[PDB]
Amino acid sequence: ADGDGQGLYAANCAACHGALATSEKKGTTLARLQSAVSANAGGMGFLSSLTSAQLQAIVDVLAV
Ligand code: HEC
Ligand code: NA
């Protein structure tokens, strides 16, 4: 259901951080992403429903 991260990034992140292929958040970390949602960085708190498995999948595709 989770895909490989590409759909999750496109649906939840690309509007603010760019298409995955040219994302400004390449090389991010799970700790940065969880902290950004939890701290509402840039208004990101609405993403608090994403699970650890979903956030990690997004981190991993940004590492490729
Ligand atoms: C617009 C409503 C955004 C959504 C959707 C996403 N991000 Fe975001 N994020 C946004 C801003 C304005 C900021 C602060 C400025 C900055 O770009 O740093 C952030 C912050 C982050 C961070 C923390 C900063 C860092 O360590 O680089 C991360 C890790 C981050 N954003 C990642 C990220 C992810 C993975 C998103 C989809 C789940 C996502 N953001 C969505 C604006 C918006
Ligand atoms: Na806000």
Author numbering: 1 to 64
Which statements did the authors publish about this structure?
PgcA has been shown to play an important role in EET but is unusual in containing three CXXCH heme binding motifs that are separated by repeated (PT)x motifs, suggested to enhance binding to mineral surfaces. The amino acid sequence of PgcA contains a cleavable Sec signal peptide followed by an N‐terminal lipid anchor and four domains interspersed by repeated (PT)x motifs. The first domain is not predicted to contain any cofactors, while the other three domains are monoheme domains (Fernandes et al., 2023). Furthermore, we demonstrate a distinct role for its domain III as a mineral reductase that is recharged by domains I and II. These findings show PgcA to be the first of a new class of electron transfer proteins, with redox centers separated by some nanometers but tethered together by flexible linkers, facilitating electron transfer through a tethered diffusion mechanism rather than a fixed, closely packed electron transfer chain.
The 1.55 Å crystal structure of monoheme domain I reveals a globular arrangement comprising residues 261–321 from the PgcA amino acid sequence. The protein contains a single heme cofactor covalently attached via thioether bonds to the cysteines of the CXXCH motif. The heme is enclosed in a peptide fold consisting of three short α‐helices separated by flexible loops, with the CXXCH motif located within the first α‐helix. The axial ligation of the heme iron is provided by His274 on the proximal side and Met301 on the distal side. The imidazole group of His274 locates within H‐bonding distance (2.8 Å) of the carboxyl group of Glu281. This interaction could influence the properties of the heme group, maintaining a suitable Em to facilitate the transfer of electrons onto low‐potential minerals. The structures of domains I and II are highly similar, with a root mean square deviation (RMSD) of 0.453 Å and share 53% sequence identity. Like domain I, domain II displays His‐Met heme ligation (in this case from residues His365 and Met392) and the imidazole groups of His365 are within H‐bonding distance (2.7 Å) of the carboxylate group of Asp372. This suggests that PgcA domains I and II likely arose from a gene duplication event and that both the heme axial ligands and the histidine coordinated acidic residues are important structural features of these domains. Domains I and II possess two acidic residues, Glu281 and Asp372, which hydrogen bond the proximal histidine of the His–Met coordinated heme. These negatively charged residues might help stabilize the Fe3+ state over Fe2+, supported by the pH‐dependent voltammograms which show that these two domains have E m that is significantly more pH sensitive than domain III.
